[PDB]
Every structure is written in structure tokens, then in C-alpha cells.
Amino acid sequence: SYTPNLTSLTNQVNRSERLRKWGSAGVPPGVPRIPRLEAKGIAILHESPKVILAGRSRCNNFDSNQYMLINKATKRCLLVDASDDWPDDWAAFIGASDLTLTHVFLTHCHIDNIINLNAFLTICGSRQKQDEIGVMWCPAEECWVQNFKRSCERYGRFEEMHQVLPMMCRSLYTPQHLVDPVRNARHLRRNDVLLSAATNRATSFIDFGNGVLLYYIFSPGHSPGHMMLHIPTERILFSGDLLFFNKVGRVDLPWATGVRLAESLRLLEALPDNTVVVPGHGRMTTLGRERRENKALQQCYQRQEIGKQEVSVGFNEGYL
Amino acid sequence: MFLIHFVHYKTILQKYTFKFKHIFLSIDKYNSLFFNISGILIWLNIIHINIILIKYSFFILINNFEYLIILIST
Numbered sequence: 362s363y364t365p366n367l368t369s370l371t372n373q374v375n376r377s378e379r380l381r382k383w384g385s386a387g388v389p390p391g392v393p394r395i396p397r398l399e400a401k402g403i404a405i406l407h408e409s410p411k412v413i414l415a416g417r418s419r420c421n422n423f424d425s426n427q428y429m430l431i432n433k434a435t436k437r438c439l440l441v442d443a444s445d446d447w448p449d450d451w452a453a454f455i456g457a458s459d460l461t462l463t464h465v466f467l468t469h470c471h472i473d474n475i476i477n478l479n480a481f482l483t484i485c486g487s488r489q490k491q492d493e494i495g496v497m498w499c500p501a502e503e504c505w506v507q508n509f510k511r512s513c514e515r516y517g518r519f520e521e522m523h524q525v526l527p528m529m530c531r532s533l534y535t536p537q538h539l540v541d542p543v544r545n546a547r548h549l550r551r552n553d554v555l556l557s558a559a560t561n562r563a564t565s566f567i568d569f570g571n572g573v574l575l576y577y578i579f580s581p582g583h584s585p586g587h588m589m590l591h592i593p594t595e596r597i598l599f600s601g602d603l604l605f606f607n608k609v610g611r612v613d614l615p616w617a618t619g620v621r622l623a624e625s626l627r628l629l630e631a632l633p634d635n636t637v638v639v640p641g642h643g644r645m646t647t648l649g650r651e652r653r654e655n656k657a658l659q660q661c662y663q664r665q666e667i668g669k670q671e672v673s674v675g676f677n678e679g680y681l
Numbered sequence: 682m683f684l685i686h687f688v689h690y691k692t693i694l695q696k697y698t699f700k701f702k703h704i705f706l707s708i709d710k711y712n713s714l715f716f717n718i719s720g721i722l723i724w725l726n727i728i729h730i731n732i733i734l735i736k737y738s739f740f741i742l743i744n745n746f747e748y749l750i751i752l753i754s755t
């Protein structure tokens with residue numbers, strides 16, 4: 362959780378809470394790795410003349426999902442929110458599909474999204490050995506990168522603790538190392554892009570190839586930097602943690618504001634209803650069904666209509 | 682009454698104690714992003730700071746996490 366200082370140790374309410382939550386143990390059980398039993402295979406969710414969406418549901422005990430976009434022309438694949446307890450099915454799928462992994466998109470840097478990121482990059486680069494995989498992320502998530510170890514402390518992920526994150530290594534946006542004159546696997550990662558919060562419909566896109574454009578949208582509230590993917594030609598909205606089936610993201614975590622989440626839900630009203638929204642957790646829905654049957658959006662627009670200047674919406678129990 | 686004037690033969694020396702800052706050590710070990718910057722524009726509603734180093738072409742990164750932060754050429 363947090364650092365045990367003098368005030369937290371001399372508090373009886375802390376021991377009372379640790380007795381009430383966890384019984385006689387007092388220590389929270391972590392979020393473990395999914396074993397090789399009760400693990401499902403990779404499903405091909407969508408097939409189109411342009412792209413192919415292949416995904417796997419409940420790949421963590423955080424109950425997150427793992428998706429990959431495949432360009433049919435250029436044979437280039439793109440993982441979004443790379444968090445799978447077994448990134449060996451995905452590397453075998455890429456190698457048996459004759460695909461090239463060039464980038465990994467990250468919506469936000471919570472632990473349910475970047476827990477197995479070094480495993481993804483290492484196994485896919487090792488298969489590429491028989492240009493490295495880049496990472497696309499927003500720099501505000503820097504504040505959630507530094508607490509990757511602490512989040513690995515509380516959720517019992519001890520083997521992923523002592524791992525330098527690839528977003529922390531020196532990119533082209535950073536100063537370079539002045540090495541002794543007498544190496545480049547970790548010293549410089551030239552394939553790295555930093556997304557900007559000024560997202561527009563004109564130039565805020567990634568050229569995926571074959572005329573397919575992936576517009577990233579800056580939508581905070583669950584994170585200081587939270588980037589959705591929008592494919593208007595395929596009507597596909599990778600929302601990440603902003604919007605789910607009949608629910609929205611949490612605000613009861615640090616660096617999460619309810620009015621930022623309300624503005625992020627309000628910047629979504631110009632998309633058509635047949636846009637399939639694809640969340641980071643749970644089952645996928647459409648944006649029209651979320652306009653009709655989601656109570657968080659109903660409360661947001663009702664507070665906006667009755668005259669609330671600072672409309673604050675958000676969940677306190679749900680997905681991280 | 683008092684008969685003699687006597688002094689004590691044992692001479693004591695007052696120990697001079699003083700606290701000075703003689704050592705200068707600091708643990709400089711952080712986990713943060715450090716950037717090559719050709720321009721930085723910090724816009725919060727009270728104070729605006731514009732720091733510009735010139736170039737032929739620039740890029741733009743924008744951070745709205747705490748306050749508006751515009752970075753030219755990362």
C-alpha cells in the first residue's frame with residue numbers, strides 16, 4: 362500500500378483495518394500469475410479486408426484483456442495494453458502467422474497493463490532474432506511508471522519487481538550515455554514514441570499501413586495520461602479503462618480525478634452508435650448501448666443538465 | 682568566620698564544542714524522465730514561462746497531467 366512511517370505503525374486503526382479486511386492473516390493476498398491450467402487460447406475477434414483483431418479475454422487475475430491488431434497488407438502486428446500472464450502463446454502466434462511486431466501501444470501504465478511488458482519485449486525480440494519492438498505511451502504515466510515496483514509490492518508480483526521498465530530506458534527524447542571509449546541493447550532504444558496530450562482528428566494518428574489510421578485520444582480521469590485508440594474505418598474504439606460494459610473506470614486510485622473522467626466521457630459523443638467499444642476489462646459493447654443503458658453516463662449528463670459546473674463521475678469499486 | 686583564602690590546585694579546561702557542517706554528501710538517485718529540450722513553455726494560470734532555443738524545425742509534446750506543459754523538440 363504505502364510506506365510504513367512512525368504514525369502508521371503507532372495507529373490502532375491500521376491494525377483494525379488489517380484485521381477487518383484480511384481476517385487473522387493481516388497481510389493481503391496478492392494477485393498471482395494465472396497457471397497453465399484454466400488458461401484459454403487466443404481468439405480471432407474480427408476479420409476485415411484491412412485489419413484483423415485477435416484477442417484473449419481474462420489473461421490476468423486483474424481480469425484484463427489482451428488485443429493485437431494485424432495489418433493484412435504489411436504483415437505488421439500491434440499489441441495494445443500488453444499484459445498477459447503467458448506471452449508464449451502470442452509469440453508462437455506471431456511466428457506461425459509470419460508477422461512482425463513493431464510497436465506496443467499502452468493506454469496507461471497501471472499494473473494491470475504493464476505487468477508482463479518486459480516479458481513481451483524479451484520473448485518477441487528473441488523470436489525476432491531467429492529493429493526492435495517499440496513502445497507507444499504518454500509521458501504523464503511516468504508518475505505511474507515509478508510506482509510500478511510499489512504496485513508490484515502490494516499485489517505480490519515479486520519476480521517483476523527488480524526489472525527496469527523499457528519506458529524508463531534512454532529513448533531519442535532523452536540525453537545519451539557518455540560511455541568510456543573502449544552495448545546498445547539497453548543503452549538506447551530508437552524505436553520509442555511519446556504521445557502528446559493535444560490529440561486532434563487531423564494529425565494525431567499512427568500510420569499502421571495500407572491506409573489504416575489509428576487515432577489516439579487523450580482521455581484522463583482514470584490516469585493522468587490515458588490514450589484510447591479509435592479506428593473510424595473499422596468502427597473500433599479501444600477504450601482501455603475509460604468505458605466498460607455498463608460501468609466506467611475507477612477514480613479511487615491516486616492521480617485520478619472525477620471531473621477529468623467526466624470530460625473524458627463528454628469528449629466521446631461525436632462517434633456513431635455502431636462503433637464497437639473494446640474495453641481493457643470484461644466484455645465488449647457498443648457506444649450506442651452505453652449511451653442508452655449506462656447509468657454513469659446518465660448521471661454525468663443529468664448533472665450537466667441540472668447545472669453542475671464541476672460534474673464529477675467515477676466508480677469506487679471495479680477494475681484497476 | 683573565615684580564616685584562609687584557598688584555591689584548588691586542579692585546573693579544569695572547558696571543552697569547546699561546536700556543530701559545523703563539515704561534510705557535504707547527498708544521495709542523488711532518482712527514477713525520472715530526463716529530456717533533451719529545445720523549448721519549454723510552462724503555462725499555469727498564475728505564471729507563464731517561455732524558454733526557447735532556436736532551431737530550423739521543432740516538435741511538440743504537451744502534458745496536461747498537473748498544469749499545461751508544452752515541450753518543443755521533446
Ligand SMILES: [Zn+2]
Binds near residue numbers: 469471583584
Ligand atoms: Zn487502469
Ligand SMILES: [Zn+2]
Binds near residue numbers: 425471602642681
Ligand atoms: Zn484496466
